[PDB]
Amino acid sequence: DLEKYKDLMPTMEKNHQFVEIYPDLANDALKRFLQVDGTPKWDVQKQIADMVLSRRSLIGISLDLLRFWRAVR
Amino acid sequence: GYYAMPKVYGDRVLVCGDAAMLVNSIHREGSNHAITSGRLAAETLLEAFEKGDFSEKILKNYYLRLKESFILKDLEKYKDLMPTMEKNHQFVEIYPDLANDALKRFLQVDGTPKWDVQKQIADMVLSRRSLIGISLDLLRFWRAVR
Amino acid sequence: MRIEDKLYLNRYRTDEENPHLKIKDESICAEKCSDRPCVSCCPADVYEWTESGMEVKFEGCLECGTCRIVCPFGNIEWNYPRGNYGVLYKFG
Amino acid sequence: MRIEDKLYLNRYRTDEENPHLKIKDESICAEKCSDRPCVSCCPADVYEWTESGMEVKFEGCLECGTCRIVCPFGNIEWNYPRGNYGVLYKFG
Amino acid sequence: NVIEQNLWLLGNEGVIKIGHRNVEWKENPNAFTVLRANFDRWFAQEVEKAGALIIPKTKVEDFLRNEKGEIAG
Amino acid sequence: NVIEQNLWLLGNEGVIKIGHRNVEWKENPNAFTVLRANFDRWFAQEVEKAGALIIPKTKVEDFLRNEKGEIAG
Ligand SMILES: Cc1cc2nc3c(=O)[nH]c(=O)nc-3n(C[C@H](O)[C@H](O)[C@H](O)COP(=O)(O)OP(=O)(O)OC[C@H]3O[C@@H](n4cnc5c(N)ncnc54)[C@H](O)[C@@H]3O)c2cc1C
Ligand SMILES: CC(C)=CCC/C(C)=C\CC/C(C)=C/CC/C(C)=C/CC/C(C)=C/CC/C(C)=C/CC/C(C)=C\CC1=C(C)C(=O)c2ccccc2C1=O
Ligand code: SF4
Ligand code: SF4
Numbered sequence: 001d002l003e004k005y006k007d008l009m010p011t012m013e014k015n016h017q018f019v020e021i022y023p024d025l026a027n028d029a030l031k032r033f034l035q036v037d038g039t040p041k042w043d044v045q046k047q048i049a050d051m052v053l054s055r056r057s058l059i060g061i062s063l064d065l066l067r068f069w070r071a072v073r
Numbered sequence: 074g075y076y077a078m079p080k081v082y083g084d085r086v087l088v089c090g091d092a093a094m095l096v097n098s099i100h101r102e103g104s105n106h107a108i109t110s111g112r113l114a115a116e117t118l119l120e121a122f123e124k125g126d127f128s129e130k131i132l133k134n135y136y137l138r139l140k141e142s143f144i145l146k147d148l149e150k151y152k153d154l155m156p157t158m159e160k161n162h163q164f165v166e167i168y169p170d171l172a173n174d175a176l177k178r179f180l181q182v183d184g185t186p187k188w189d190v191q192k193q194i195a196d197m198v199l200s201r202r203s204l205i206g207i208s209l210d211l212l213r214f215w216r217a218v219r
Numbered sequence: 220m221r222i223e224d225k226l227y228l229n230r231y232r233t234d235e236e237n238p239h240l241k242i243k244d245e246s247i248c249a250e251k252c253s254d255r256p257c258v259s260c261c262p263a264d265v266y267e268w269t270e271s272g273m274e275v276k277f278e279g280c281l282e283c284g285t286c287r288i289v290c291p292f293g294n295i296e297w298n299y300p301r302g303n304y305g306v307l308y309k310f311g
Numbered sequence: 312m313r314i315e316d317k318l319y320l321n322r323y324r325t326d327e328e329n330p331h332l333k334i335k336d337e338s339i340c341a342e343k344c345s346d347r348p349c350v351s352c353c354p355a356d357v358y359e360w361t362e363s364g365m366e367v368k369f370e371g372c373l374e375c376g377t378c379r380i381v382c383p384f385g386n387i388e389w390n391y392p393r394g395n396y397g398v399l400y401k402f403g
Numbered sequence: 404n405v406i407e408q409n410l411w412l413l414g415n416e417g418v419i420k421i422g423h424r425n426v427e428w429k430e431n432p433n434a435f436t437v438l439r440a441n442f443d444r445w446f447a448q449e450v451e452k453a454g455a456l457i458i459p460k461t462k463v464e465d466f467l468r469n470e471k472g473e474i475a476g
Numbered sequence: 477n478v479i480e481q482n483l484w485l486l487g488n489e490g491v492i493k494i495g496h497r498n499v500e501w502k503e504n505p506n507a508f509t510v511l512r513a514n515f516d517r518w519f520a521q522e523v524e525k526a527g528a529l530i531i532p533k534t535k536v537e538d539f540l541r542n543e544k545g546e547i548a549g
């Protein structure tokens with residue numbers, strides 16, 4: 001278990017994103033998904049995309065899912 | 074929904090709510106669609122009462138308001154949603170019971186060295202359905218969610 | 220027996236002289252139908268296929284409308300009960 | 312004031328004649344240190360940098376060990392208190 | 404007043420709860436749970452106060468038509 | 477006895493609860509919450525009943541060494 005999460009906290013130190021934007025963005029996305037305000041569900045599927053691709057680019061999201069994949073091994 | 078709704082208008086007649094099959098059942102917005110459809114029909118008839126015409130020339134504005142609002146756009150989105158769910162029978166047959174045994178194995182502590190729980194989860198997920206079935210089903214549903 | 224324990228919880232004003240569930244042709248239910256989906260998909264156990272015909276206990280009908288739709292041959296003359304009759308859902 | 316409200320909740324047997332937190336060189340804390348990480352990372356507000364020197368209120372020490380480690384110059388003679396002294400965590 | 408919306412994946416013995424509780428739904432509500440005999444009886448009272456004559460205990464069987472062949476009642 | 481293990485993603489006002497409650501942990505437990513002054517005082521009593529002499533109130537300062545230079549106490 002120590003060899004597995006060996007380079008785990010040095011991975012977490014070189015982002016400062018998974019606890020800085022990533023929870024607060026997953027909360028505003030799931031709030032917009034459940035909020036009913038007469039918005040026709042394509043304009044909430046793109047407002048979530050305008051939420052996730054505004055605080056971090058898509059070259060940062062798809063990188064960070066497998067950059068942590070090296071930390072989880 | 075979209076493939077099965079009637080003509081929602083006619084000569085001196087409008088159709089609202091579930092009678093026009095306006096239900097987003099996957100988001101559970103049927104009363105959301107019903108209370109709006111009453112507002113769109115009543116604003117259509119209030120146009121029809123100042124003009125005095127109630128035929129399909131003035132009452133077609135209800136069908137125009139029904140697709141300029143969220144009601145028919147939510148129906149076009151999940152149009153081929155339940156025919157997608159009918160042609161798998163996997164997302165409620167193996168997929169919940171497999172995500173429960175995987176997350177139970179992830180949290181169970183029994184002296185197994187965390188690589189042999191990361192592969193027992195892989196031996197759990199790639200035993201009830203192949204990887205050509207998992208990676209297919211994530212985007213086969215992607216066509217249902219649009 | 221089992222679901223009429225739970226149908227006792229509902230409130231009804233039964234219209235016994237006006238059955239709103241009539242079967243148009245009893246012979247379709249005997250030889251033309253194989254599985255009887257009106258029996259196996261009725262949430263209130265209204266339909267029961269005896270050998271004497273189809274027993275339609277319309278007094279427990281929850282007015283859902285499944286029987287009319289699930290019947291492949293269309294031989295269920297399905298109406299709502301009259302006004303102030305049928306199920307009367309309290310806190311529905 | 313603020314955290315000594317919460318340090319009052321803990322149980323201590325204080326060893327006042329034996330301070331287990333000694334600073335090896337007070338001059339390193341005056342000119343060599345810039346940010347004083349012993350003050351800003353002590354969970355019990357033990358260290359306070361006055362202009363009279365460093366006030367080490369060792370009586371509230373929670374014996375974590377952060378001060379010894381966060382100090383870049385190593386000039387904290389850090390010991391545990393003696394046996395039966397220091398924090399005595401009830402339902403720790 | 405609905406402040407938390409959960410999705411539960413029931414297993415043989417477990418459950419995967421995926422909820423989302425939001426506390427701005429406590430003062431700006433998104434949704435309420437209702438019982439429709441209690442809601443539509445109150446909603447009928449507001450429609451009655453608005454000036455509409457609500458006629459219960461009455462089932463519509465067909466439409467009375469004029470000689471133009473359209474729905475006249 | 478821990479039967480549910482949640483992970484919460486706190487937002488500005490919301491939370492994404494991702495739990496997992498299992499009911500076979502009620503009869504075959506996986507984990508208990510403890511308070512370590514209550515656990516290690518009980519665990520000391522079982523070690524004392526096993527035959528070990530637990531000596532509290534005693535801090536080890538160094539090791540007494542033999543003339544071979546190894547730890548002899
Ligand atoms: C189990 C269940 C759960 C649901 N949960 C949700 C949810 O969480 N959120 C949501 O948004 N939607 C939900 N819905 C959907 C919602 O109930 C409907 O989509 C919507 O409320 C129907 O509105 P309506 O105006 O058509 O009224 P309905 O209740 O469908 O019917 C309108 C009225 O017409 C009357 N009527 C019918 N025929 C006649 C006649 N011939 N003469 C006179 N009166 C007649 C009936 O008495 C009825 O009261 C749910 C539906 C079900 C079945
Ligand atoms: C760090 C971060 C990535 C952690 C991941 C946590 C994750 C589980 C949620 C937040 C991540 C965000 C950014 C993903 C974007 C898209 C989201 C909103 C997809 C929605 C699907 C699920 C996961 C929603 C969460 C569970 C819960 C809140 C649902 C409420 C219950 C009702 C109202 C919804 C019903 C409902 C169900 C059950 C569906 O399966 C479904 C599938 C596809 C489209 C829509 C739906 C749907 O509306
Ligand atoms: S479904 Fe139609 S045919 Fe089959 S039994 Fe019920 S009524 Fe008779
Ligand atoms: S209406 Fe619903 S309940 Fe009454 S009979 Fe048809 S199915 Fe059974």
Ligand code: SF4
Nearest residue numbers: 339340344347349382
């Ligand atoms: S950290 Fe070391 S140097 Fe900086 S103040 Fe505390 S003791 Fe003096």
Ligand code: SF4
Nearest residue numbers: 353372373375376378
């Ligand atoms: S031990 Fe923990 S508490 Fe005591 S001084 Fe060093 S840091 Fe502050």
